[PDB]
Design a protein around this ligand. Structure first.
Ligand SMILES: *C(=O)[C@]1([C@@H](O)[C@@H]2C=CCCC2)NC(=O)[C@H](CC)[C@]1(C)O
Ligand SMILES: *C(=O)[C@]1([C@@H](O)[C@@H]2C=CCCC2)NC(=O)[C@H](CC)[C@]1(C)O
Ligand SMILES: *C(=O)[C@]1([C@@H](O)[C@@H]2C=CCCC2)NC(=O)[C@H](CC)[C@]1(C)O
Ligand SMILES: *C(=O)[C@]1([C@@H](O)[C@@H]2C=CCCC2)NC(=O)[C@H](CC)[C@]1(C)O
Lengths: 222, 216, 216, 223, 223, 220, 216, 222
C-alpha cells in the first residue's frame, strides 16, 4: 500500500494506490484508500483493511456530528486531535496485528495565509501526530520509495495540476519498487484515486485526468 | 395520587409555557421545506439540521428543546453508523421524539414545555413529497401534509397559512407567505433555513443576512 | 386516593383515551384474517406484522401501542431464534401482551391508553380456524371467534358486524362488510392488511392504493 | 469447502459444494452451505460449521427484525455493515480456531441500473468487507482454483443460466484440485446447491437443474 | 465408547455400549449411555461421563419445562437447537478436557411422511449440528468401526427389528476393534442398551431381546 | 402540604427569585477593550467574577456556595473540551448552553432550586475582530443573548435603567468603569468594596485580568 | 409535589433553634494571629480544633454533627496537601468545602445540621497577612468576617459587646479578656486556643490549666 | 533526543534538539520538544513521542486548571508533584515500551533569593523526582554526552546569554556523538529550540539568536 500527500500553492492533494493483498496474493485491484472526510479534509489509510475503513467512516461521522451539535466545524487542530485519539484507541488491537495508520490532508479555512493553508498530518500507532512542514508525506509499504521520489520532484510542484502529476509519479515509483503497491493497470483501466483540496473544498479527481498523467509518465520512461 | 388531576395539571403547565413562547412555521414548497421562526437571538437557534435530508424546528423552552435537538442528532448519527446513512428517516426521528416526550411527560417532575417539528425531503434526484411531523409535549405525533405551526398563538398563523398556501410555491413566494402568516419582521428578528432537496447530500441550508434580505 | 379509587381513576383515564380514538376491526374470513382501520396518516401505522403467521392491530395512543408493537416483534424474534420459528404462536404473543399491560396498568404512573388485537392464521397448507385475541389496557385478554372491534365507539360497529358477518366470506365480501360496520372512507383514509393463510411463510400482506381501490 | 458467486446481466448466482470433513475424513456429503437470507440476498459460509450456521441464522433473523421494526428493509449497504459487525464480533473466537468467513450475494432493488444491480461482497476475519467489482468471488479452501477457473470462463457468462453453469463448473474445478471440496456425486445423486437472485428475488435452483449441468460438464471432459 | 443410531421404515433405533474406562483400566461394565429424553427422543452421549450425564439429565428437564410452561412440546427443530446451545455452553470446559458429544435420535410427530419421520442428529464441540441424511450415525472412540460396519449392513434394514439387529452388530464390530468399547459380556449377562422410537413413542428395548441378538451374532461368527 | 405542579413551579421560582434579589449586584458590559465585570463585593477572598477559559469570563450573583459550584463545573467543562478537541473550539456560547442545561436540571430535579443568576462573556481572539458576547442564564435554565450589558442580583431595575442611559458603545476602560460603578451605586464604593476584572481583547491568549488595589484606584 | 417554600422555613427554624439553644463561641483576630474562646465545661469533648498547618476550626451546635465535619475537614485538608503541596491548602478552600457540604446536608438529609462553623487562617511563618475568618451557616451560607465571629446561643449581646471592645492588634491577654468579657454578656468552663502566626509550621496551640489561668 | 536545562544567575534555560526517528530512519527534522507550560515553567520530554506530547499538553492544562479554580497558581513543589503523579500513572504503559520522561525547568517566584530562584527537576519512570542542585541536567539518548559537555563548560555561565550558548553547545556535542540527536541543520535552517525563564516569566528564544550561537560554535570548531 502507498498513500501520498503533498502541498501546492493554494491547496493540497492526496492520492492512493488500488491494491490489496493477502500474503503474496493480489486479492484486490480497485480498492479506494483515500476518502473525503468533510468539506476540507481527506484521509488516506494504510495497514489492516478492516480497521482503516472503519477509521475513515467513523472519523467522518465524528466530524459532522460535532458540526451539527455545535453549529460550527471543529478547528483543524481539533480534527487532528480526534483522529489521534481514534488511532490511540486502537493501540491494543494494533499490537495484536490490527494496525492501521492514517495520513490526513486538509485546507485550513482559518489559516492566515491562503496560499499555504494546506495541511498534511501524519500519525503513529500510539496516536502521536506531526504536522508535516516539508511539503509532502506518505504512508504504507511503498512510502519510502514515494518520498524519495517526491524529494527529487517536489520543486516541480507549482499548482494543483503539477502537484497531481508529482503525486501520481510518486505512486508510480512506489509501485515500481514495492510489490505490495499497485501500479496503473492499463489493461483493466484502473488507476490511483486522488482528492484535491483548496479554498473551494475537497473534490475527487476524475479518473480520466489521472489516466492521462499516468500514460504520460509511462511514455516518458519508455 | 389521583391519576386524573395530575394528567390535567401537567398538561396545562406545558400548553401554557408553549403558547407563551415565540412562533415557528414549517411549510412544504417547490424546492423542499422552509423553516421560519421568530427569533431575535443571533446565537440561540430553534431550527437545526438533524441528518442528511432531515430538519428540526421547535418552539418552547430553549434548554428543553435544545436538549431534544442534541438527543435527536445523537440518535440519527448512531443509526446511520450502525446501518447506513440512507436508513435514517424523518419518520424514525419523529417516532423517537414521541417516545421521548411521552416518557418525559409521564415520568418527569415537570413535562417539557416544547413542541417539535421534524421534516424530511427527498434524496437528491429522487421524487417524493416532503414530510412534516409535529410532536407534542404529551408525545402525540401528527403527520402534516402542507405546513406546521408551533408556539405562541397558532390559530391566527394557522388560518393565515390556510388562505395563502400554495403547493409548489417558489422559495420567495413561500418565504413571503410564511413571514406574513407569522405576523398574523426583518432579517434581524428571523431565523430562516431550508431542507433543499436539490443539495446532493446535506439538504439543510441557512438563509441569512443579505441573502435573506433579498428573498424577503 | 384509595387503591379502590386508583383503579377506577386509571381505568377511566384509559377508557377515555381509547374511546376518543379511531376504530379498528379484525375479522376472520375465507383466506385468513382481515385488518381494517380508520387511518388518515400515510406513515403512522396501526396494523403490523408480528411474526410469520401472526398479526397485530391496535387502537389508542400511537406512541404507546407502537411501543407495544416493537416489544412484541422483539419477543417473537427472540423466541423463534432461541427455539424454532414454528414454536412462536399468537396465543404466546397475546399472553405476553396481557402480562405487559397488566404490569403497566398497575405499576406505571399512567396506564396505557390502548387496546390490542393479536391474530394468527394457519401455517401454509395446514387447516385451522384463525385465532383472534383482544388484550385490554388492564391486561384482560379475550378469545374472540369471529371478529374484534377496538377504539372509539365500538357498540355501533360491533352490532353492525354481528349482523353482516358471513363465515368464509371472500376477501371482497369481508372488506365491504368491515368498511360498512366501521362507518356505522377510501384508500386515503383507511389502512388495510391481511394475514393471508395462503402465503408460504410470511402471511402479513398490506392492501393499498389501486389494489385496495379495486377491492373497494 | 468452496463457495462461489458471480454476477450476470440482471442478477447474481451463488453456489456451494456439499462436503464436510474432519481432518482427512469425509464426515458429510449433503451439507447445504448457501442460504437465502432475505428476499434479495444469499449468504454462503466457509470455515467452522458451528459458527457458519449461526452466522446465517442470526443474520436472517436480524435482517427481518429490522424490517418488521422499521417497516422497510435495510439498504444493501446496511445489510453489508450488519454482516461485517457480526463477523468482527467473532474475531476473538476466530483466533481460537472458530473462524468463519461469509460471502454475500444480493440484488439491490434501489440500484440505478437494474442490469448491474447484482452485488457480491467478501469479508475478512476482522469484519473488513469489499464489494467485488471484477464479476465473481469465492471463499474456502478451493477458492483459488475456482477463481482461476472463473477467470477463464467468465466471458461466457451472458445471463443467469450460463452464470449458473459456470458457477457449477468452477465448483467442479475446485473439487478436482482440492480434496476438501466435494465434487458432483453421481452414485448418490448429490450435487452442489445454488441460489439465483434477480429483480424477482432470491430463489433456490432446483437440484435437477444442477444435476443436468453437472452431467453435461462430466460428459464433455470425458470426450 | 460407542453409540449408534439408525433410521428404519417408521422409526429410529439408538444403542450404546456399557463400558467405562480410566486410562487402560476397565472401570465400569454396566454404564447406561442412552436415555429417553422425552416421549419421542433419545440422547446417547460419549466423552467425559460427568458432563455426558449432566447433559442428558438437564436436557430432559429443559424439554419438559418448555412443555409445561407452553402447553405444547418444542418442535423437533427447537429440540435440536436447545441441545446445540447446551453443547456450545460447555465449549470452554471442553477445551480444558471436559468434552462431551451427544447423538440425538427422535421421531417427528409433525413430519409429513410417517415412514421417514425418524431423525438422527449429530453435534460437534462448538454446538454445530447436522441432521443426518445417510440413515445412520455413531459417536465415540469406536464410531468409525461402527459406521463402516453399518455401511455394509444397512441395506438389511427394513423395519425396527432388522434395524435393532444392525445396531447391535455395529456395536459388536466397534468392540471387536476398539478396546474402549465394551462387547456383549456373556459371563456376567451384560449387553448394550437400546431405545426404539416410532409413532407410539420412545421405549427401552428389553435386555432379553438384546441378549438374544448378541448371542446370535457371537454364535454366527464362532463358525 | 401537597401542591399542584403549577404551584410548585411558582414556588421554586419565588424561592430562588427571592434569594437572588436578597443578594449584592453585578454588572458586565461591553466596552472598547473587551468586557468589563464590576460587582459589589466586600470580601477579599470570596469571588463572584472568574476566568472560565482563554477568552471566556464568568460572573454570578446569588448564594456563593451554589454559583462557585457552577463556576468550578464550568472550568471543568471547558478544560475537558479544550483538551478533547482544541482550545479554539471552546466558546462562550457553549458554556452558556451548558449552564442553561445544568440550572434547568437543578431547578427541576433537586429539592431546592439554585438561588443564582449567571453571566458568561466572551471577547474576540487576539488580533481578531468580533463584538463581545454576553449571556445571562437564570435559575431555571433560561438563557438570553444580551448585546451591551447584563445586570444580576438584588434590585436590577434601577441599575438597568441607569445603564440604559449612561451606557455608551466603545467607551474606554475608565469611562466604562465609571458608568458601571455609578449605575451599580444606584442600587445599594471604593476598591475595598468592589471586585473588578476585564476580558482583554489585546492580550494574546488569556484575556481575563483582575483590576485591583492602587491600579483600580487610579481608574477611579 | 410537596411545598418547597414551607420546607426551607421548617428546616431553617429547626436549625436556628438548636444553634440558638447552645453554648457560644467567639474567634477574633489579634496581634499574634487568631484567638478561639468557647463556653465549654467538658474536659474531653472539644469545639475548637486544628484543621491544617495555619488553619483552625471552631463550632457551635450539636457535637456529634460538628465533630463529623471536623473530621471531614481534616480529611479533606490532609488529602489535598498530599495530592499537591502543604502550602496549597488554605482557609478559604476549607470554608468553601464546608459551605458546599452543609448546603447539601441542608437540602438532601432528613434533618439539617444544627451547627455553625468558623474556619480561620493566619499567615505562614515570617510572612505578613491579615488573619482570615469565615463563618459557615447550617444552610451553607458563607461569610468573610474581618475582625471576629460569634456563633451559638444568643449572639446579639456577645456581638455588640465585641463591636465595642474589639481592638485592632490587641495583645493576647487583652484579646482574651475582651473575649471572655463579651462572652459573659472560669478555666474549667472555658476552652481556649490560638492560631499562633509565630509558630514555624503548626500554628494551632491550646492554652489551658495554669498557663490559661495566668493570662487572666 | 536530547533535552538540556541549566541555571544561570537570575534564571534558567531549557533547550531541545529537533530530530525524530523510527529505528535508523530520520522521520522528522523540526519537532519541538520544549514547551512553556505556564508563565514560569517549561517542560522538555524524551521517549515515546505520542506520550511525551500528551504529557506536555495535559500538564499545562492541569496547572492552569488549578489556577482558575483556586485563584492562585500551585507552589513550585505542587507543580513538581503533579508532574510526578502524571509520570507514575504511565508506568504500566512504560513497561510495555511507551516510556516518556520529562525534564522540568522553572523560576520560583516565591523563592527567597531571586538570583538562584531557577529550578531544574528530573523524573524517573516511576514518578520519582529530584530537584537538581549541580546546575544542569539533561534527558534522552544524548544526555550523557550533553552532561559531560556542560560539566566542562558550566563555569562559563555568567548570565542568560552565556547560559544559552552553553546549552546550545551541549546539544551540539550530544548530536556529534548520538545519531538519535539532531545537530544544527544549516541547509534547511533548522536549529534547536530554547526557552529562557527569569523573574519576567518564560519566553521562547528567537530562532535567529540560536542560529548565531550555532554558527559561532561550528566556526569555532572548524
Ligand atoms: C496496505 O496497507 C495494504 C492494503 O491491502 C489495505 C487495503 C485496503 C485499504 C487499507 C490498506 N494492507 C496490507 O495489509 C497489504 C500488505 C502489506 C497492503 C497491500 O500493503
Ligand atoms: C469448508 O469450509 C469446510 C466445511 O466442512 C464446513 C461445513 C459446513 C458449512 C460451513 C463449512 N470447513 C472446514 O472446516 C472443512 C476443513 C477442510 C471444510 C470441508 O473445508
Ligand atoms: C466413552 O466415551 C467413554 C465412557 O467412559 C463414558 C462413560 C459413561 C457415559 C459417557 C461416556 N469416555 C471416556 O473418556 C472413555 C475412554 C476413551 C470411554 C470408555 O470411551
Ligand atoms: C527522543 O527521545 C526521540 C524523539 O523521536 C521523540 C519525538 C518528539 C518529542 C518526544 C521525543 N524518541 C525516540 O524514541 C527516538 C529514538 C531513540 C528519539 C529521536 O530519541
Amino acid at each position: 500500500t502507498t498513500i501520498v500527500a503533498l502541498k501546492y500553492p493554494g491547496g493540497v492533494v492526496m492520492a492512493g494506490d488500488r491494491r490489496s493483498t493477502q500474503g503474496n496474493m493480489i486479492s484486490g485491484r480497485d480498492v479506494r484508500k483515500v476518502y473525503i472526510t468533510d468539506d476540507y479534509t481527506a484521509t488516506g489509510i494504510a495497514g489492516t483493511a478492516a480497521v482503516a475503513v472503519e477509521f475513515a467512516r467513523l472519523y467522518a461521522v465524528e466530524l459532522e456530528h460535532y458540526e451539527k451539535l455545535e453549529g460550527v466545524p471543529l478547528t483543524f487542530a481539533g480534527k487532528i486531535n480526534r483522529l489521534a485519539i481514534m488511532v490511540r484507541g486502537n493501540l491494543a488491537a494494533a499490537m495484536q496485528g490490527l494496525l492501521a495508520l492514517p495520513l490526513l490532508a486538509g485546507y485550513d479555512i482559518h489559516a492566515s495565509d491562503p496560499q499555504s493553508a494546506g495541511r498534511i498530518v501524519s500519525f503513529d500507532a500510539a496516536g502521536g501526530w506531526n504536522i508535516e512542514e516539508e511539503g509532502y508525506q506518505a504512508v504504507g509499504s511503498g512510502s519510502l520509495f514515494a518520498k524519495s521520489s517526491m524529494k527529487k520532484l517536489y520543486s516541480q510542484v507549482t499548482d494543483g495540476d503539477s502537484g497531481l502529476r508529482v503525486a501520481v509519479e510518486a505512486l508510480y515509483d512506489a509501485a515500481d519498487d514495492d510489490s505490495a503497491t499497485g501500479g496503473p493497470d492499463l489493461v483493466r483501466g484502473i488507476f490511483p484515486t486522488a482528492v484535491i483540496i483548496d479554498a473551494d473544498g475537497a473534490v475527487d479527481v476524475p479518473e480520466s485526468r489521472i489516466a492521462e498523467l499516468a500514460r504520460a509518465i509511462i511514455e516518458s520512461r519508455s | 395520587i389521583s391519576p386524573e388531576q395530575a394528567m390535567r395539571e401537567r398538561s396545562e403547565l406545558a400548553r401554557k409555557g408553549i403558547a407563551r413562547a415565540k412562533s415557528v412555521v414549517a411549510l412544504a414548497y417547490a424546492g423542499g421545506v422552509l423553516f421560519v421562526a421568530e427569533n431575535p437571538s443571533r446565537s440561540l437557534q430553534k431550527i437545526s439540521e438533524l441528518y442528511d435530508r432531515v430538519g428540526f424546528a421547535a418552539a418552547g423552552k430553549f434548554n428543553e428543546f435544545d436538549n431534544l435537538r442534541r438527543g435527536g442528532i445523537q440518535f440519527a448519527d448512531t443509526r446511520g453508523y450502525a446501518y447506513d446513512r440512507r436508513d435514517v428517516t424523518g419518520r424514525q426521528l419523529a417516532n423517537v421524539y414521541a417516545q421521548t416526550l411521552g416518557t418525559i411527560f409521564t415520568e418527569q417532575a415537570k413535562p417539557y414545555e416544547v413542541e417539535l417539528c421534524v421534516a424530511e425531503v427527498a434524496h437528491y434526484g429522487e421524487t417524493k413529497r416532503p414530510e412534516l411531523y409535529r410532536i407534542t409535549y404529551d408525545g402525540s405525533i401528527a403527520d402534516e401534509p402542507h405546513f406546521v405551526v408551533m408556539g405562541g398563538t397558532t390559530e391566527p398563523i394557522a388560518n393565515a397559512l390556510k388562505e395563502s398556501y400554495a403547493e409548489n410555491a417558489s422559495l420567495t413566494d413561500a418565504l413571503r407567505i410564511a413571514v406574513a402568516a407569522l405576523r398574523a419582521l426583518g432579517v434581524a428578528s428571523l431565523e430562516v433555513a431550508v431542507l433543499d432537496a436539490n443539495r446532493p447530500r446535506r439538504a439543510f441550508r441557512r438563509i441569512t443576512g443579505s441573502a435573506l434580505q433579498a428573498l424577503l
